[PDB]
Design a protein around this ligand. Structure first.
Ligand SMILES: O=C(S)Nc1ccc(-c2c3ccc(=O)cc-3oc3cc(O)ccc23)c(C(=O)O)c1
Ligand SMILES: O=C(S)Nc1ccc(-c2c3ccc(=O)cc-3oc3cc(O)ccc23)c(C(=O)O)c1
Lengths: 16, 284, 284, 20
């Protein structure tokens, strides 16, 4: 959940 | 085997000009300097097909005006925006799009490796052409009418790839077997097959049974030949991490272990990255 | 547009073949089944020019013998070894390769990925041709170290390249400005430029509403067009972590935030991976 | 230290993967 929030950081940035 | 790059730079600073001149001192770069807005507008309107890249300093006077007139005239070329606006912050890389959506932002102290950034601007324009611009779009919705000269950005884009491009052999992947093309059912089916393969990696990570090269290369082959976006791989990771965050929060263990599996995600993406990099047909 | 791949499968098990026929249910794959070692060895001679890819199950009796003999006849084609059945008495593993270096290894339940793995098996062969076998490319004819002076693998590689490959256009990066080609001084100024750029990323990585993403782009641009391997990026990350490590021991807390900086590495590599993925064209 | 050590293991396979 917490890292799921932190992983989504890297997800949305390279979309971009 | 490299075509010349005609660069028009709008700079009114004796400092930045020299920084660009030293960085683009190579024979490949044809430097044209305009030290005023009027001069830029004058040169651009009569050398529209002779500008491959624009180097614009955002802090220039009447910057919005000049770019807007450039934009309405259809002079939309690859561009690098240097510094920020003069209303009224100091000098740092720009924040919002000032010219068009394929532009590049550089600070005044990031001009040393400008040749690589010129390559990036050119390449990004080619990828996004015809490019959305920040003026002629006009705007707040105060449009009027014509024109639609969409050929201009396309004629330039094709012309540039006929000059800044080369031909190489590539493995004919099956586009019909790409992730974004498979029907909704088969799409999530391959998604689970990859979820299973990635779980095989996370467990075999830190063992090592194992042959971690094989388990990872197995996953990377699917991500590559199905043209699976990098965002999906990260998505698979956090999905699995979400499950493991639950496990530890029940067996009374710490979620501190999840930090160490960031290495796993680094490892796989690095492998995927080299797969694409290796496949690039190089002629040297 | 897509050429037909001719598959030669050597399998003894009923369940293994049943999955292979199911996975390659598409009419694109010519399946030729051999339910014994002697059937394969005989089909190998009669149809040596009619084999695109091999699928050799290790669990098949006298495996190494069939493989040893297969290299003698000159039969060197893309392969996919399935499952694990290491022989107990040859006493010469190794296991760096069973057939040839560009061979693929799969699991007995990882066969629903075969179409993508067949692609990988073919592409890997083309990239590493000619390859090395643990049966002929070391001995005997004729030191050193193969009975194919005119490159029989390349006569096949060219044959597979024209059917399984296409011709696209790439942005020609300057090879003279690649990191490994630049003059020693030029190479380490760019390296310092990337170290500086990366530090800027890290220091502002947990700073919201910043030029972080613009900082990433400008680093990745240098990384992509100087054709630096991902390892160097990983190396750059370390050199800064070492710096921060010592920095934290005195005049600071512990080195736990370094684990939080693993996100930064994932973030940057992901960008770089996408940029390579985006730089792949279509056939047109 | 440890971070350098665990980042080095990621490099290792890139050196000796399925490629040259
Ligand atoms: O401040 C303004 S105004 N626009 C803006 C618009 C978008 C971005 C940006 C992102 C902003 C929010 C977000 O959640 C993810 C982002 O990924 C990016 C990736 C890029 O490659 C470039 C810019 C961004 C950024 C940035 O942070 O540099 C700035
Ligand atoms: O612990 C140290 S120190 N070095 C190291 C260096 C390389 C490897 C290694 C791999 C490490 C990470 C990875 O993702 C894939 C790997 O495939 C390998 C294949 C091999 O044949 C040999 C070593 C490795 C391994 C490992 O087995 O975990 C360890």
């Amino acid at each position: 959940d917490e890292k799921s929030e932190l992983s989504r950081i890297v997800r949305g940035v390279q979309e971009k | 085997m490299l075509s010349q790059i005609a660069i028009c730079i709008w700079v009114e600073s004796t400092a930045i000009l020299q920084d660009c001149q030293r960085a683009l001192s190579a024979d490949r770069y044809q430097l044209q300097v305009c030290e005023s807005g009027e001069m830029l507008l004058e040169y651009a309107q009569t050398h529209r097909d002779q500008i491959d890249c624009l180097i614009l300093v955002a802090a220039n006077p009447s910057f919005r005006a000049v770019v807007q007139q450039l934009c309405f005239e259809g002079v939309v070329v690859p561009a690098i925006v240097v510094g920020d606006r003069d209303s009224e912050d100091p000098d740092e890389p720009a924040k919002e799009q000032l010219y068009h959506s394929a532009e590049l932002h550089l600070g005044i102290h990031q001009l040393e490796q400008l040749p690589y950034q010129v390559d990036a601007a050119l390449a990004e324009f080619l990828r996004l052409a015809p490019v959305e611009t920040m003026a002629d779009h006009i705007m707040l919705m105060g449009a009027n009418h014509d024109p639609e000269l969409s050929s201009q950005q396309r004629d330039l884009a094709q012309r540039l790839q006929e000059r800044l491009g080369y031909l190489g052999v590539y493995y004919k992947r099956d586009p019909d077997r790409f992730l974004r093309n498979l029907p909704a059912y088969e799409s999530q089916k391959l998604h689970q097959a990859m979820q299973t393969s990635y779980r095989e990696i996370v467990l075999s990570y830190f063992s090592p049974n194992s042959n971690l090269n094989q388990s990872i290369d197995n996953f990377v082959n699917m991500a590559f030949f199905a043209d699976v976006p990098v965002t999906k791989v990260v998505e698979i990771h956090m999905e699995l991490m979400d499950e493991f965050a639950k496990k530890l929060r029940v067996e009374g263990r710490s979620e501190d272990i999840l930090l160490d599996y960031r290495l796993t995600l680094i490892d796989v993406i690095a492998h995927l990255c080299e797969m694409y990099r290796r496949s690039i047909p190089r002629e040297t």
